[PDB]
Amino acid sequence: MYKDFANFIRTNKKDLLNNWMNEMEKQSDPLINDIAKEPMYEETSIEFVDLIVSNITENGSKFNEKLDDFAEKVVHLGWPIHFVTTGLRVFGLLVYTAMRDEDLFLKREEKPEDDAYYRFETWLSSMYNKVVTAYADTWEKTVSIQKSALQELSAPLLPIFEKISVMPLIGTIDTERAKLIIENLLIGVVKNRSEVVLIDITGVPVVDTMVAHHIIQASEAVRLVGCQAMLVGIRPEIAQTIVNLGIELDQIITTNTMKKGMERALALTNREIV
Amino acid sequence: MGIPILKLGECLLISIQSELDDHTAVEFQEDLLAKIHETSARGVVIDITSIDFIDSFIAKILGDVVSMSKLMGAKVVVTGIQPAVAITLIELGITFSGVLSAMDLESGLEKLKQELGE
Amino acid sequence: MGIPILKLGECLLISIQSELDDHTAVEFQEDLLAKIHETSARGVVIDITSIDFIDSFIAKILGDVVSMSKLMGAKVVVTGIQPAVAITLIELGITFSGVLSAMDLESGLEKLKQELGE
Amino acid sequence: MGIPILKLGECLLISIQSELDDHTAVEFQEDLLAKIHETSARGVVIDITSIDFIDSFIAKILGDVVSMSKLMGAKVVVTGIQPAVAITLIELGITFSGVLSAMDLESGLEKLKQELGE
């Protein structure tokens, strides 16, 4: 039941206000005081806790949307899952204290039993479950969109000259980025015909053994398709790793920087320098 | 059946449209060798565009075919080995495999024409 | 699967290896038309050397294909049409079959090169 | 302190006078890499005249330097690796060690100049 539960929430709201004034001291007092004033936070809390059980014992769509709004507001406000968990813990603490003091349960009886005594905790857990369910949706969505953006941005082959396809990569290449690089480079050289592909290594902070191995294999595969691969702008740490790999390092034709890499590629296409 | 030897311009063009391993490998190698010996062509041009799956078998078969053709004349894999099979070729059949022509058959004909004009 | 259409110098090459009825003729005409439509080639070259027996139906199919391609581009039956198939093609499918070489692929390719370069 | 990096013309010159085993080897490695990354010179020249005794570590480090700055430009080990150190380099550091100029730094500079001019 949700009616008498709301009738007792009419005082559990003041109990939770006491809970808030007890809890605000322990964690981030200046931050909480500065970001929002106490009366506004208190009224938001009582709105969140009072209309949850205003429906007929089943659910409420409007308050579900309000709970999602509260979850996103507390995510933006600086209350992660840990802070909401501390809030739930202090909620339980002050509910227990009020039970000791108020002693006014749901069902009318000269001495009520454990039924409502634990139905209170079950309803608290249900509210917390709904809150955490609404908590992670926006975070997962933004993680997904950021992952898609990094997936698309790692291998820009769009910079293209006449018979030249310069491919700059600047991020820290890991396993996934290395596989993405090789896949996109091969598919692009397939789609767009070319003769020289400049791989701009200048920018990557650290390349481990396997990433360097896959980059050299990318160069060899591009050569095997029929296009010279000029690995341009390699930095001494990457040279450290590449030679320490121990593979043969004569088929790759490197270059100090794209300034002269472009003109050397044009030199390969003898009459394209003009 | 599926090994279309074509002769033109004192060269030879061959094409693959079968995409299977065993009979393609054996019949292809024997037929290409038999023709390149029977008709004296300096440059033989091979096709891989249709192929979209390669294992170690066909990879080593192509390597041996290129080696033998080089043992009788100029050899080129005119069409770029597709990426899904380029990776397989480079992991196991580690070879330069003659000269290449960037998935352009006409480009390979031009390359062999200029290399035989000298 | 058995028709290796090839491109070189913005021309087109065909290779026929097996004869069949009601499947190969129709699939061949459809594939050749689709190819010559998607990639614009002003000269297409067809091959018959392998075949050694043609009835009325294949002869009519080849005549229709010749006129078909001539409706959008010059073509040639470059390959020697063998005496039996030549006699049958005259006897039932009465058509001059456009410009033809019918000696070997090289001769017709050279003829098309010299007729299209001008 | 022991790594006199000199830039003259469109080149880079180095003279070695430490012959120490580990510390000088690594500091020379790092200084040469930092200099070649800082200033872009197509040819770098290394001197080994002062040295007459080299163990495995220095030979490996020198081959590593050859690969290192070959990944960004041509080079010559101008000074003739002395007979003892040459033999040790062969028996341990098995490589061609880039282009060489055999003890005449004028000859090495001239060779690098004519290689860059063309």
The total of other beta-carbon atoms located within 10 Å of residue C79's CB is: 23
**Coil, strand or helix at A236:** helix
The C-alpha of A206 sits at a distance from chain B's nearest C-alpha, in angstroms, of 25
Contact of B27 with chain A, judged by CB distance below 8 Å, is answered with no
- Nearest in space to C49 (alpha carbons), one of C82, C19, C24, C93: C82
CA A195 to CA D98: how far, in whole Å? 27
Q: Which long-range contacts (CB under 8 A, 24 or more apart) does A54-57 make?
A: A54/A2, A54/A6, A55/A2, A56/A2, A57/A1, A57/A2, A57/A3
Q: Quick check: A233 and D71 in contact, CB under 8 A?
A: no
The total of other beta-carbon atoms located within 10 Å of residue A100's CB is: 8
CA A171 to CA A180: how far, in whole Å? 12
From chain B residues 61-90, the ones with a CB under 8 A of any chain A CB are 80-83, 86-87, 89-90
The Cβ-side half-sphere exposure at B75, using a 13 Å CA radius, reads 18
**Are C6 and B109 within 8 A, CB to CB?**
no
Q: Beta B74-77 vs B99-100: how paired, if at all?
A: parallel
What backbone torsions phi and psi does residue A199 show, to the nearest 5 degrees?
Answer: -95, 115
Angle (CA) C103-C107-C108 rounded to 5° is: 90
The Cβ-side half-sphere exposure at D79, using a 13 Å CA radius, reads 16
Which strand (E) or helix (H) includes residue D109? helix D105-117
The strands making up B74-77's β-sheet, listed across from edge to edge, are B6-8, B11-13, B43-46, B74-77, B99-100
Q: Quick check: D100 and D109 in contact, CB under 8 A?
A: no
The C-alpha of B80 sits at a distance from chain C's nearest C-alpha, in angstroms, of 15
- Residue B65 to residues B7, B8, C4, Cα–Cα distance (Å): 18, 20, 20
What backbone torsions phi and psi does residue A134 show, to the nearest 5 degrees?
Answer: -75, -15
The first and second tokens of residue A73, run together, are 């507001």
CA C99 to CA D80: how far, in whole Å? 72
**Residue-wise DSSP of B73-92:** SEEEE-SPPPHHHHHHHHHH
Cα D84 versus chain centre, distance: 17
CA C12 to CA B55: how far, in whole Å? 31
**Are B105 and C4 within 8 A, CB to CB?**
no
- Report helix, strand and coil shares of chain A as percent, to nearest 5: 65, 5, 30
**Residue A203: CB partners within 8 Å, gap ≥ 6?**
A168, A169, A170, A171
CA A9 to CA A50: how far, in whole Å? 6
**Coil, strand or helix at A28:** coil
Q: Beta A164-165 vs C6-8: how paired, if at all?
A: unpaired
**Are D37 and A254 within 8 A, CB to CB?**
no
**Max Cα-Cα span within chain A:** 103
Q: Which residues in A lie closer than 8 A to residue D66 (C-beta atoms)?
A: none
Q: In the PDB record, what is the listed experimental method? A: cryo-EM
CA C107 to CA B104: how far, in whole Å? 23
CA A261 to CA A131: how far, in whole Å? 57
Chain B residue with Cα closest to A213:
B91
Q: Which chains touch D (3 or more CB pairs under 8 A)?
A: A
Which of A236, A249, A260 has its CB closest to that of D33?
Answer: A236
**Are B83 and A194 within 8 A, CB to CB?**
no
What backbone torsions phi and psi does residue D75 show, to the nearest 5 degrees?
Answer: -155, 165
- Nearest in space to C42 (alpha carbons), one of C8, C4, C78: C8
Q: Quick check: D73 and A256 in contact, CB under 8 A?
A: yes
Residue type for position A136:
A
Cβ contacts from B onto C, under 8 A: 43
Identify from B6, B79, B107, B114 which residue to disrupt to test chain C contact, counting C C-beta atoms within 10 A and taking the largest count.
B6
**Coil, strand or helix at B69:** helix
CA B62 to CA B68: how far, in whole Å? 10
Q: Which residues in A lie closer than 8 A to residue D64 (C-beta atoms)?
A: 243
- Nearest in space to D13 (alpha carbons), one of D27, D39, D30: D39
Angle (CA) A83-A85-A88 rounded to 5° is: 115
Q: Quick check: B73 and B44 in contact, CB under 8 A?
A: yes
Give, to the nearest 10 degrees, the angle between helix A61-77 and helix A114-153. Answer: 60
Give, to the nearest 10 degrees, the angle between helix D23-38 and helix A236-245. Answer: 120
Q: Which residues in A lie closer than 8 A to residue D42 (C-beta atoms)?
A: 256
Contact of A220 with chain B, judged by CB distance below 8 Å, is answered with yes
CA B101 to CA A119: how far, in whole Å? 76
Contact of C7 with chain B, judged by CB distance below 8 Å, is answered with yes
Q: Which residues in D lie closer than 8 A to residue A254 (C-beta atoms)?
A: 70-72
Resolution in A, one decimal?
3.9
Q: Could you give the dihedral angle defined by the CA atoms of residues A14, A15, A17 and A20, in that order, rounded to the nearest 10 degrees? A: 180
Q: Beta A164-165 vs A160-161: how paired, if at all?
A: antiparallel
- Residue the block writes with tokens 């002769």: B7
Contact of B100 with chain A, judged by CB distance below 8 Å, is answered with yes
CA A53 to CA A134: how far, in whole Å? 18
